[PDB]
Amino acid sequence: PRGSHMMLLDVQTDSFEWLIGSPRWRESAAERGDVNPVGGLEEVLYELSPIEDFSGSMSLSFSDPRFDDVKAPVDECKDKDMTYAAPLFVTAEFINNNTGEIKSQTVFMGDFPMMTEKGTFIINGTERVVVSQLVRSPGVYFDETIDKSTDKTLHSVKVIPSRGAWLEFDVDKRDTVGVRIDRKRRQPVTVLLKALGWTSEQIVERFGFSEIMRSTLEKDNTVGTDEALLDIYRKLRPGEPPTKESAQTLLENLFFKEKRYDLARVGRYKVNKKLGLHVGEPITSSTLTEEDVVATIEYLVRLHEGQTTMTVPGGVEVPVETDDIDHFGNRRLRTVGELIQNQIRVGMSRMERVVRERMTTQDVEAITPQTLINIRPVVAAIKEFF
Amino acid sequence: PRGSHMMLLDVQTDSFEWLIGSPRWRESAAERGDVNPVGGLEEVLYELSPIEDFSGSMSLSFSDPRFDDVKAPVDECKDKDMTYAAPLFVTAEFINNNTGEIKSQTVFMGDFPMMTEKGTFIINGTERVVVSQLVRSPGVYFDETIDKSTDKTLHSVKVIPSRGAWLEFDVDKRDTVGVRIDRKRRQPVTVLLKALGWTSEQIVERFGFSEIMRSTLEKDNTVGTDEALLDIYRKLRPGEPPTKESAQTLLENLFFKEKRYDLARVGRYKVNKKLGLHVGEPITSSTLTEEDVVATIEYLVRLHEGQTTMTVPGGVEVPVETDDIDHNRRLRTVGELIQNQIRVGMSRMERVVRERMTTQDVEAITPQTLINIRPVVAAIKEFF
């Protein structure tokens, strides 16, 4: 329950105009100034494009989202218990990287519920008002709890971007240090370290001061960078055929590429500040770095052993403490358009999984965008939202 | 932040029709089978009527909340930075109980922001959406906490009504049992007991099993009921001269009178089961009782003692445990939200009436001389 107590109608309706990339939004973005304006649905399509198989001999890209006219007037949608919506169409482009052949099509991506003049939606005849929400603002947040069972003191940390996957570390009751990538299952943190190119020697050179890091390294079953990369792939894409190259591409696109990851200026500043990085640098790139990952793990571990300061290589000394003040200032306001955009992403990612798996079972000459694209996860996500 | 994630527009517009007691609502509430329907503003006026002076020699009562036409239309209010509103009038009659004379007048209560067809309000030209909230449902809720500085287990309890003042008890890290009334400042719980007419002997008799209750009673600097009542009044009403009577009156009005306090049937039931009170008896009232207050303190105290069972005098055995307040919760519509701000404004308007009832000449007293609508317009202006 994180809804606003009060909303400005115009701010929310403007955010829906943005989400659908409407003309009025373009001219409002043109006056207020200025260029590089990207629609909400535009962004989502741009983010996941291109979708590739593990080979990767196939790619599929999305672009140019637009709408047809509404299927029925509002009053007709009310007196017939229908949803006020407009058909969504995108430009999908399939590429066979072996031949270089390109197959472009227009694809229907489902009926998209449109905001009325009242700033409302009409779902199944019922008029609804979507409320803006207060969510955790970008940053890196450390905390402390007590285990329900053994009553040991536990520490965890969340790297929360403005946009993209979550990265979570924790010390558990079995004295291990773990990593959760994109809310997936828990792995020993040494796995992620190796996937980034760290040898066991470098790991003990850096984290040898901690015994739980030395024990985690022992009870860690991966041997080498390649094996760690594949363990991550299996945790994130179960049932799908792993390769060293696609897992490597996967990890890069999760945190280190601007396309699907963004801390934004506020997140990048707060991460630098908290960990003592970029001591004299301005904010340019808003992706995570290898330094951020290593620093965060070190911070968590020193926090667990009861240390109060720390200094990363080339950084300044910072206090090591929980961010227990995870209230007031550490929250931001997500408009209606942004909320819908987020649910679109979720549906899109499930659609993206089906594309990859259909790329491995379909005949490459019969493969078109239409054969690859199942829009059900997208219409189910919107359905779930309302 | 406790707003809904989604509202149904027809629910919110209906709640506003209910608030202003419109004919549209009165119809809608007739076909639904609601017998004897009462509007939102109408309900509030009843809760505070009549306002009687201490001596019982005069009274002031309110009725018939009604509106004229709105000042400017929606468009005109948007263009001129005007608030889209309609003047509110009530009927207020003053009775002199000595002479039997009645003085009835129509009183202006201020400009009332009206909800549009979009479920919005135009305030100074800007269109705004008030959001329904999810609040804690009625009942009595015990929880457990760990103090960082001592690793001590702390327990707290909140008695939440459907309508009215909160009541909180807690065990701190100094092993004192305290109370917060209407979310005001903490006092030792023995002050509340003394204020309710309990003596130290009666307190030691009922709560002697607890060392922290003995300790709280020791460190309690209040001697007797009268001193306890004054201390409470000081905490609840700062800057104001504390008398004997206006302290007892305040405490009665907080929890034990229907005018200002309502557990609702769900609350009354939940409190009964939790504390093992009136096991088979039917619900006759939804106010708090002294029995509830004492039982709640005892529960919290036994909870801290590590005890697993409690049997209140004349009650049944209940398990002693914390509550896992996960879900419950209830929905407060926009109309109900506005109604609560009206209550606040009206209650301040009420205190001024009582003040003016003392210092004015009864033969010159009219409803217009008693009613100052400034706290009401302030509560409304603040809300939006």
XYZ file of N, CA, C and O in Angstrom, chain A residues 156-325:
680
model
N 22.088 -7.491 4.876
C 21.783 -7.600 3.458
C 21.948 -6.243 2.785
O 22.054 -5.217 3.456
N 21.971 -6.242 1.457
C 22.114 -5.001 0.705
C 21.400 -5.084 -0.644
O 21.396 -6.130 -1.293
N 20.778 -3.980 -1.047
C 20.083 -3.909 -2.324
C 20.643 -2.794 -3.193
O 20.721 -1.643 -2.763
N 21.038 -3.135 -4.414
C 21.377 -2.121 -5.403
C 20.146 -1.862 -6.264
O 19.775 -2.683 -7.103
N 19.510 -0.719 -6.040
C 18.265 -0.386 -6.714
C 18.487 0.702 -7.755
O 18.769 1.845 -7.409
N 18.363 0.347 -9.040
C 18.563 1.334 -10.103
C 17.282 2.113 -10.369
O 16.250 1.829 -9.764
N 17.353 3.088 -11.266
C 16.159 3.773 -11.732
C 15.436 2.878 -12.727
O 14.230 3.008 -12.943
N 16.186 1.952 -13.314
C 15.697 1.151 -14.422
C 16.611 -0.050 -14.637
O 17.814 0.104 -14.843
N 16.040 -1.249 -14.582
C 16.812 -2.459 -14.790
C 16.708 -3.459 -13.654
O 15.835 -3.356 -12.792
N 17.616 -4.430 -13.651
C 17.563 -5.538 -12.703
C 18.105 -5.181 -11.319
O 18.982 -4.328 -11.180
N 17.573 -5.849 -10.300
C 18.059 -5.684 -8.937
C 19.275 -6.563 -8.674
O 19.422 -7.633 -9.265
N 20.143 -6.096 -7.783
C 21.306 -6.862 -7.355
C 21.342 -6.870 -5.834
O 21.452 -5.816 -5.204
N 21.232 -8.057 -5.246
C 21.134 -8.179 -3.796
C 22.184 -9.122 -3.227
O 22.389 -10.222 -3.739
N 22.848 -8.683 -2.164
C 23.777 -9.539 -1.438
C 23.312 -9.694 0.005
O 22.591 -8.843 0.525
N 23.725 -10.780 0.649
C 23.350 -11.017 2.036
C 24.280 -12.009 2.722
O 24.863 -12.881 2.077
N 24.416 -11.860 4.035
C 25.064 -12.869 4.858
C 23.956 -13.647 5.547
O 23.044 -13.054 6.123
N 24.018 -14.972 5.477
C 22.962 -15.791 6.063
C 23.411 -16.515 7.329
O 24.557 -16.391 7.760
N 22.488 -17.276 7.912
C 22.708 -17.955 9.185
C 23.687 -19.126 9.093
O 24.116 -19.662 10.121
N 24.025 -19.529 7.871
C 24.995 -20.598 7.664
C 26.375 -20.020 7.355
O 27.260 -20.720 6.862
N 26.536 -18.734 7.664
C 27.804 -18.025 7.514
C 28.321 -18.012 6.079
O 29.521 -18.142 5.839
N 27.407 -17.850 5.129
C 27.782 -17.732 3.726
C 27.378 -16.368 3.180
O 26.427 -15.751 3.662
N 28.108 -15.899 2.178
C 27.764 -14.653 1.509
C 27.149 -14.968 0.153
O 27.758 -15.647 -0.675
N 25.933 -14.483 -0.070
C 25.202 -14.828 -1.272
C 24.871 -13.658 -2.175
O 24.894 -12.504 -1.751
N 24.567 -13.966 -3.432
C 24.105 -12.960 -4.378
C 22.794 -13.396 -5.031
O 22.638 -14.551 -5.426
N 21.844 -12.470 -5.114
C 20.625 -12.695 -5.880
C 20.598 -11.750 -7.074
O 20.596 -10.531 -6.910
N 20.586 -12.319 -8.273
C 20.592 -11.524 -9.494
C 19.206 -11.476 -10.122
O 18.631 -12.514 -10.438
N 18.679 -10.264 -10.290
C 17.353 -10.047 -10.873
C 16.266 -10.833 -10.141
O 15.370 -11.398 -10.770
N 16.369 -10.864 -8.813
C 15.421 -11.567 -7.943
C 15.394 -13.084 -8.143
O 14.454 -13.750 -7.711
N 16.418 -13.631 -8.791
C 16.494 -15.077 -8.977
C 17.026 -15.759 -7.719
O 17.209 -15.121 -6.685
N 17.277 -17.058 -7.816
C 17.694 -17.845 -6.661
C 19.074 -17.445 -6.147
O 19.860 -16.821 -6.859
N 19.363 -17.819 -4.906
C 20.603 -17.417 -4.245
C 21.804 -18.248 -4.704
O 21.695 -19.459 -4.900
N 22.940 -17.580 -4.887
C 24.198 -18.230 -5.237
C 25.285 -17.675 -4.318
O 25.140 -16.571 -3.795
N 26.374 -18.437 -4.106
C 27.514 -17.870 -3.378
C 28.096 -16.680 -4.134
O 28.204 -16.732 -5.360
N 28.466 -15.626 -3.411
C 28.912 -14.380 -4.029
C 30.199 -14.564 -4.834
O 30.496 -13.783 -5.738
N 30.949 -15.611 -4.511
C 32.201 -15.892 -5.203
C 31.960 -16.331 -6.646
O 32.851 -16.229 -7.490
N 30.754 -16.816 -6.923
C 30.369 -17.181 -8.285
C 30.328 -15.945 -9.179
O 30.873 -15.944 -10.282
N 29.680 -14.892 -8.688
C 29.587 -13.637 -9.422
C 30.971 -13.027 -9.621
O 31.267 -12.472 -10.679
N 31.813 -13.138 -8.598
C 33.178 -12.629 -8.671
C 33.962 -13.294 -9.807
O 34.647 -12.619 -10.577
N 33.844 -14.617 -9.905
C 34.552 -15.379 -10.930
C 34.007 -15.047 -12.317
O 34.772 -14.884 -13.263
N 32.686 -14.924 -12.432
C 32.048 -14.585 -13.707
C 32.537 -13.244 -14.250
O 32.470 -12.985 -15.452
N 33.025 -12.395 -13.351
C 33.571 -11.101 -13.733
C 35.062 -11.188 -14.064
O 35.670 -10.194 -14.463
N 35.644 -12.372 -13.894
C 37.025 -12.609 -14.286
C 38.008 -12.738 -13.136
O 39.221 -12.683 -13.341
N 37.489 -12.918 -11.925
C 38.334 -13.042 -10.739
C 38.787 -14.478 -10.492
O 37.980 -15.406 -10.504
N 40.087 -14.650 -10.264
C 40.628 -15.935 -9.840
C 40.457 -16.062 -8.332
O 40.237 -15.065 -7.644
N 40.564 -17.284 -7.819
C 40.459 -17.521 -6.383
C 41.551 -16.774 -5.629
O 41.369 -16.387 -4.474
N 42.685 -16.572 -6.293
C 43.808 -15.857 -5.700
C 43.463 -14.384 -5.493
O 43.734 -13.824 -4.436
N 42.860 -13.767 -6.505
C 42.433 -12.374 -6.410
C 41.349 -12.202 -5.353
O 41.280 -11.172 -4.682
N 40.501 -13.217 -5.215
C 39.413 -13.180 -4.244
C 39.944 -13.177 -2.813
O 39.468 -12.410 -1.974
N 40.933 -14.025 -2.536
C 41.524 -14.074 -1.199
C 42.463 -12.894 -0.942
O 42.656 -12.485 0.203
N 43.041 -12.348 -2.006
C 43.859 -11.146 -1.885
C 43.001 -9.978 -1.414
O 43.457 -9.122 -0.657
N 41.747 -9.963 -1.858
C 40.846 -8.849 -1.587
C 39.947 -9.083 -0.374
O 39.729 -8.171 0.423
N 39.430 -10.300 -0.233
C 38.457 -10.594 0.818
C 38.962 -11.595 1.851
O 38.175 -12.142 2.624
N 40.271 -11.829 1.867
C 40.864 -12.794 2.779
C 40.676 -12.476 4.251
O 40.749 -13.368 5.097
N 40.431 -11.206 4.560
C 40.251 -10.765 5.942
C 39.003 -11.367 6.577
O 38.910 -11.493 7.800
N 38.043 -11.727 5.732
C 36.795 -12.326 6.181
C 36.867 -13.847 6.086
O 37.306 -14.395 5.072
N 36.439 -14.525 7.147
C 36.411 -15.982 7.157
C 35.178 -16.543 6.461
O 35.233 -17.629 5.880
N 34.068 -15.808 6.515
C 32.863 -16.212 5.795
C 33.049 -16.088 4.284
O 32.391 -16.787 3.517
N 33.945 -15.202 3.862
C 34.291 -15.086 2.450
C 35.249 -16.199 2.046
O 35.230 -16.665 0.906
N 36.087 -16.621 2.988
C 36.998 -17.735 2.754
C 36.251 -19.064 2.803
O 36.589 -20.000 2.076
N 35.237 -19.142 3.659
C 34.425 -20.349 3.765
C 33.468 -20.458 2.580
O 33.251 -21.549 2.049
N 32.901 -19.325 2.173
C 32.016 -19.283 1.013
C 32.764 -19.758 -0.221
O 32.224 -20.498 -1.039
N 34.019 -19.338 -0.336
C 34.862 -19.718 -1.463
C 35.120 -21.225 -1.496
O 35.245 -21.816 -2.569
N 35.191 -21.843 -0.319
C 35.435 -23.279 -0.213
C 34.193 -24.089 -0.551
O 34.258 -25.073 -1.289
N 33.057 -23.671 -0.004
C 31.798 -24.368 -0.232
C 31.174 -24.001 -1.587
O 30.134 -24.541 -1.975
N 31.826 -23.081 -2.293
C 31.478 -22.726 -3.665
C 31.985 -23.826 -4.591
O 33.167 -24.174 -4.555
N 31.089 -24.367 -5.413
C 31.399 -25.540 -6.227
C 31.878 -25.247 -7.648
O 32.229 -26.167 -8.387
N 31.905 -23.977 -8.037
C 32.359 -23.626 -9.378
C 33.882 -23.569 -9.447
O 34.538 -23.143 -8.497
N 34.441 -24.006 -10.571
C 35.884 -23.928 -10.781
C 36.228 -23.158 -12.058
O 36.248 -23.718 -13.155
N 36.484 -21.864 -11.906
C 36.876 -21.033 -13.028
C 35.811 -20.047 -13.470
O 34.649 -20.144 -13.070
N 36.216 -19.097 -14.306
C 35.324 -18.059 -14.810
C 34.192 -18.637 -15.661
O 33.033 -18.246 -15.515
N 34.536 -19.571 -16.541
C 33.561 -20.173 -17.449
C 32.445 -20.918 -16.719
O 31.277 -20.807 -17.086
N 32.805 -21.677 -15.688
C 31.820 -22.443 -14.934
C 30.873 -21.547 -14.141
O 29.696 -21.865 -13.979
N 31.395 -20.428 -13.648
C 30.591 -19.487 -12.877
C 29.578 -18.782 -13.778
O 28.425 -18.588 -13.397
N 30.020 -18.410 -14.977
C 29.161 -17.745 -15.954
C 27.966 -18.611 -16.351
O 26.864 -18.106 -16.567
N 28.193 -19.920 -16.429
C 27.148 -20.862 -16.811
C 26.192 -21.140 -15.653
O 25.016 -21.441 -15.876
N 26.688 -21.045 -14.421
C 25.827 -21.231 -13.257
C 24.835 -20.082 -13.166
O 23.678 -20.278 -12.803
N 25.301 -18.882 -13.500
C 24.445 -17.704 -13.525
C 23.385 -17.842 -14.614
O 22.220 -17.498 -14.408
N 23.789 -18.360 -15.769
C 22.869 -18.557 -16.884
C 21.754 -19.534 -16.512
O 20.587 -19.313 -16.843
N 22.119 -20.606 -15.815
C 21.153 -21.620 -15.393
C 20.184 -21.091 -14.341
O 19.037 -21.537 -14.270
N 20.646 -20.153 -13.521
C 19.804 -19.563 -12.485
C 18.826 -18.559 -13.084
O 17.707 -18.398 -12.596
N 19.257 -17.887 -14.146
C 18.465 -16.830 -14.766
C 17.607 -17.336 -15.922
O 16.493 -16.856 -16.135
N 18.130 -18.303 -16.669
C 17.401 -18.884 -17.788
C 17.352 -20.405 -17.694
O 18.004 -21.094 -18.478
N 16.577 -20.935 -16.733
C 16.482 -22.390 -16.559
C 15.843 -23.077 -17.764
O 14.893 -22.550 -18.343
N 16.372 -24.237 -18.137
C 15.836 -25.004 -19.248
C 16.404 -24.601 -20.595
O 16.245 -25.317 -21.584
N 17.071 -23.452 -20.636
C 17.645 -22.941 -21.876
C 19.116 -23.341 -22.010
O 19.848 -23.360 -21.020
N 19.545 -23.672 -23.237
C 20.914 -24.136 -23.512
C 21.977 -23.059 -23.285
O 21.994 -22.048 -23.991
N 22.865 -23.281 -22.305
C 23.902 -22.314 -21.928
C 25.142 -22.389 -22.814
O 25.559 -23.479 -23.209
N 25.711 -21.229 -23.129
C 27.035 -21.149 -23.736
C 27.834 -20.111 -22.965
O 27.262 -19.299 -22.238
N 29.152 -20.139 -23.123
C 30.021 -19.176 -22.457
C 29.762 -17.766 -22.975
O 29.799 -16.796 -22.218
N 29.488 -17.664 -24.272
C 29.328 -16.376 -24.933
C 28.018 -15.678 -24.573
O 28.001 -14.474 -24.322
N 26.922 -16.433 -24.554
C 25.611 -15.854 -24.276
C 25.454 -15.493 -22.802
O 24.794 -14.512 -22.465
N 26.060 -16.289 -21.926
C 26.058 -15.988 -20.499
C 26.857 -14.716 -20.242
O 26.489 -13.893 -19.406
N 27.949 -14.567 -20.980
C 28.806 -13.396 -20.878
C 28.064 -12.157 -21.367
O 28.174 -11.082 -20.776
N 27.304 -12.316 -22.447
C 26.488 -11.235 -22.989
C 25.355 -10.892 -22.023
O 24.982 -9.728 -21.867
N 24.822 -11.921 -21.373
C 23.726 -11.766 -20.423
C 24.143 -10.910 -19.230
O 23.450 -9.961 -18.860
N 25.286 -11.248 -18.640
C 25.784 -10.542 -17.464
C 26.161 -9.100 -17.790
O 25.976 -8.202 -16.968
N 26.686 -8.883 -18.992
C 27.044 -7.539 -19.439
C 25.810 -6.656 -19.592
O 25.817 -5.490 -19.195
N 24.749 -7.219 -20.162
C 23.528 -6.463 -20.418
C 22.636 -6.273 -19.193
O 21.681 -5.493 -19.229
N 22.943 -6.982 -18.112
C 22.171 -6.851 -16.882
C 22.487 -5.560 -16.135
O 21.581 -4.885 -15.645
N 23.771 -5.221 -16.055
C 24.210 -4.128 -15.192
C 25.139 -3.111 -15.855
O 25.215 -1.964 -15.417
N 25.843 -3.523 -16.902
C 26.950 -2.719 -17.413
C 26.686 -2.043 -18.757
O 27.580 -1.418 -19.328
N 25.461 -2.164 -19.257
C 25.089 -1.497 -20.500
C 23.915 -0.548 -20.293
O 22.924 -0.898 -19.648
N 24.036 0.651 -20.853
C 23.056 1.715 -20.664
C 21.680 1.345 -21.205
O 20.668 1.931 -20.813
N 21.650 0.361 -22.097
C 20.424 -0.042 -22.775
C 19.338 -0.529 -21.816
O 18.205 -0.049 -21.863
N 19.683 -1.479 -20.950
C 18.702 -2.070 -20.041
C 19.021 -1.817 -18.574
O 18.418 -2.429 -17.690
N 19.971 -0.927 -18.313
C 20.307 -0.581 -16.939
C 20.632 0.900 -16.798
O 21.371 1.472 -17.600
N 20.074 1.512 -15.762
C 20.270 2.930 -15.519
C 20.089 3.234 -14.038
O 19.011 3.018 -13.475
N 21.153 3.715 -13.403
C 21.071 4.171 -12.022
C 20.513 5.584 -11.998
O 20.037 6.052 -10.961
N 20.582 6.246 -13.154
C 20.307 7.678 -13.293
C 21.304 8.509 -12.490
O 22.135 7.963 -11.764
N 21.229 9.827 -12.632
C 22.157 10.714 -11.936
C 22.064 10.577 -10.419
O 23.083 10.559 -9.729
N 20.843 10.472 -9.909
C 20.616 10.378 -8.468
C 21.174 9.082 -7.872
O 21.755 9.089 -6.787
N 21.007 7.975 -8.590
C 21.499 6.690 -8.131
C 23.010 6.614 -8.180
O 23.645 6.139 -7.240
N 23.582 7.092 -9.282
C 25.026 7.077 -9.479
C 25.730 7.935 -8.429
O 26.788 7.567 -7.921
N 25.135 9.079 -8.107
C 25.682 9.961 -7.084
C 25.640 9.303 -5.708
O 26.618 9.344 -4.961
N 24.506 8.698 -5.378
C 24.326 8.092 -4.063
C 25.187 6.844 -3.869
O 25.601 6.541 -2.750
N 25.463 6.130 -4.957
C 26.344 4.966 -4.894
C 27.794 5.399 -4.706
O 28.500 4.858 -3.853
N 28.230 6.377 -5.500
C 29.560 6.962 -5.341
C 29.761 7.474 -3.921
O 30.775 7.202 -3.285
N 28.776 8.227 -3.440
C 28.816 8.825 -2.113
C 28.937 7.757 -1.021
O 29.796 7.843 -0.135
N 28.078 6.748 -1.100
C 28.005 5.707 -0.081
C 29.273 4.860 -0.020
O 29.698 4.437 1.057
N 29.877 4.618 -1.181
C 31.021 3.719 -1.270
C 32.348 4.458 -1.445
O 33.415 3.844 -1.403
N 32.278 5.770 -1.647
C 33.471 6.589 -1.769
C 34.179 6.460 -3.104
O 35.407 6.405 -3.159
N 33.402 6.420 -4.182
C 33.958 6.261 -5.522
C 33.878 7.568 -6.301
O 33.155 8.484 -5.906
N 34.620 7.637 -7.406
C 34.613 8.794 -8.304
C 34.855 10.092 -7.538
O 34.152 11.081 -7.742
N 35.862 10.075 -6.665
C 36.071 11.131 -5.673
C 36.169 12.553 -6.234
O 35.868 13.521 -5.535
N 36.584 12.678 -7.490
C 36.695 13.982 -8.120
C 36.112 13.991 -9.518
O 36.415 14.870 -10.326
N 35.265 13.006 -9.800
C 34.684 12.842 -11.126
C 33.236 13.323 -11.158
O 32.530 13.250 -10.151
N 32.791 13.823 -12.322
C 31.380 14.160 -12.523
C 30.586 12.907 -12.874
O 31.178 11.842 -13.059
N 29.267 13.033 -12.961
C 28.417 11.902 -13.316
C 28.226 11.820 -14.829
O 27.558 12.664 -15.423
N 28.820 10.804 -15.449
C 28.679 10.606 -16.889
C 27.913 9.326 -17.212
O 26.785 9.377 -17.705
N 28.527 8.180 -16.935
C 27.861 6.900 -17.138
C 27.005 6.562 -15.921
O 27.391 6.829 -14.782
N 25.841 5.975 -16.167
C 24.918 5.657 -15.090
C 24.708 4.151 -14.959
O 23.769 3.699 -14.304
N 25.581 3.376 -15.589
C 25.549 1.932 -15.418
C 26.363 1.548 -14.197
O 27.111 2.361 -13.655
N 26.208 0.303 -13.765
C 27.029 -0.236 -12.697
C 28.425 -0.469 -13.256
O 28.606 -0.563 -14.470
N 29.419 -0.542 -12.378
C 30.762 -0.916 -12.797
C 31.200 -2.142 -12.009
O 30.527 -2.550 -11.061
N 32.320 -2.735 -12.405
C 32.873 -3.860 -11.668
C 33.278 -3.396 -10.273
O 33.201 -4.151 -9.306
N 33.691 -2.136 -10.182
C 34.105 -1.541 -8.917
C 32.946 -1.453 -7.929
O 33.116 -1.738 -6.744
N 31.773 -1.064 -8.421
C 30.583 -0.948 -7.583
C 30.225 -2.288 -6.956
O 29.916 -2.368 -5.768
N 30.267 -3.340 -7.767
C 29.953 -4.684 -7.300
C 30.913 -5.124 -6.200
O 30.482 -5.541 -5.125
N 32.209 -5.024 -6.475
C 33.231 -5.425 -5.513
C 33.170 -4.580 -4.238
O 33.297 -5.104 -3.130
N 32.964 -3.275 -4.398
C 32.880 -2.371 -3.253
C 31.689 -2.698 -2.363
O 31.795 -2.671 -1.136
N 30.554 -3.007 -2.988
C 29.325 -3.309 -2.259
C 29.464 -4.576 -1.420
O 28.998 -4.632 -0.280
N 30.117 -5.587 -1.986
C 30.344 -6.842 -1.283
C 31.285 -6.627 -0.103
O 31.050 -7.140 0.993
N 32.347 -5.858 -0.330
C 33.291 -5.532 0.732
C 32.595 -4.772 1.860
O 32.786 -5.083 3.037
N 31.786 -3.784 1.486
C 31.035 -2.977 2.445
C 30.156 -3.860 3.320
O 30.147 -3.723 4.541
N 29.420 -4.768 2.682
C 28.529 -5.685 3.388
C 29.289 -6.562 4.375
O 28.856 -6.757 5.510
N 30.423 -7.086 3.929
C 31.229 -7.994 4.736
C 31.863 -7.296 5.942
O 31.831 -7.819 7.057
N 32.429 -6.115 5.718
C 32.999 -5.332 6.810
C 31.907 -4.889 7.779
O 32.140 -4.772 8.982
N 30.715 -4.648 7.244
C 29.562 -4.293 8.061
C 29.174 -5.468 8.951
O 28.718 -5.284 10.082
N 29.369 -6.678 8.437
C 29.021 -7.891 9.167
C 30.006 -8.178 10.297
O 29.609 -8.624 11.374
N 31.287 -7.924 10.050
C 32.321 -8.178 11.049
C 32.379 -7.097 12.129
O 33.052 -7.263 13.147
N 31.676 -5.993 11.902
C 31.563 -4.946 12.901
C 32.523 -3.787 12.721
O 32.751 -3.013 13.651
N 33.097 -3.664 11.527
C 33.967 -2.535 11.222
C 33.124 -1.296 10.932
O 31.948 -1.403 10.581
N 33.721 -0.119 11.084
C 32.965 1.124 10.978
C 33.428 2.021 9.835
O 32.746 2.980 9.480
N 34.595 1.719 9.272
C 35.095 2.449 8.111
C 35.642 1.483 7.063
O 35.868 0.305 7.348
N 35.847 1.989 5.851
C 36.486 1.213 4.793
C 36.993 2.132 3.691
O 36.501 3.249 3.519
N 37.988 1.656 2.951
C 38.566 2.421 1.855
C 38.874 1.500 0.682
O 39.757 0.647 0.771
N 38.141 1.664 -0.415
C 38.419 0.894 -1.620
C 39.628 1.492 -2.336
O 39.923 2.678 -2.167
N 40.350 0.666 -3.113
C 41.489 1.135 -3.912
C 41.143 2.350 -4.771
O 40.264 2.273 -5.628
N 41.827 3.464 -4.527
C 41.600 4.681 -5.285
C 40.404 5.483 -4.803
O 40.019 6.471 -5.428
N 39.817 5.057 -3.689
C 38.671 5.745 -3.125
C 38.989 6.391 -1.791
O 40.082 6.213 -1.253
N 38.039 7.152 -1.260
C 38.208 7.783 0.043
C 37.607 6.921 1.146
O 36.823 6.011 0.876
N 37.979 7.209 2.388
C 37.463 6.450 3.520
C 36.041 6.879 3.862
O 35.760 8.065 4.034
N 35.145 5.904 3.949
C 33.741 6.173 4.227
C 33.302 5.408 5.468
O 33.905 4.392 5.817
N 32.255 5.897 6.152
C 31.758 5.132 7.297
C 31.018 3.884 6.830
O 30.291 3.933 5.836
N 31.220 2.774 7.531
C 30.484 1.553 7.244
C 29.353 1.393 8.246
O 29.578 1.103 9.420
N 28.130 1.596 7.770
C 26.961 1.555 8.631
C 25.728 1.206 7.814
O 25.718 1.359 6.592
N 24.691 0.730 8.492
C 23.432 0.427 7.833
C 22.774 1.712 7.351
O 22.988 2.783 7.921
N 21.979 1.602 6.292
C 21.202 2.732 5.804
C 19.804 2.660 6.394
O 18.819 2.926 5.704
N 19.735 2.301 7.676
C 18.477 2.086 8.394
C 17.438 3.175 8.139
O 16.234 2.919 8.174
N 17.912 4.389 7.871
C 17.036 5.482 7.477
C 16.541 5.281 6.046
O 16.778 6.117 5.173
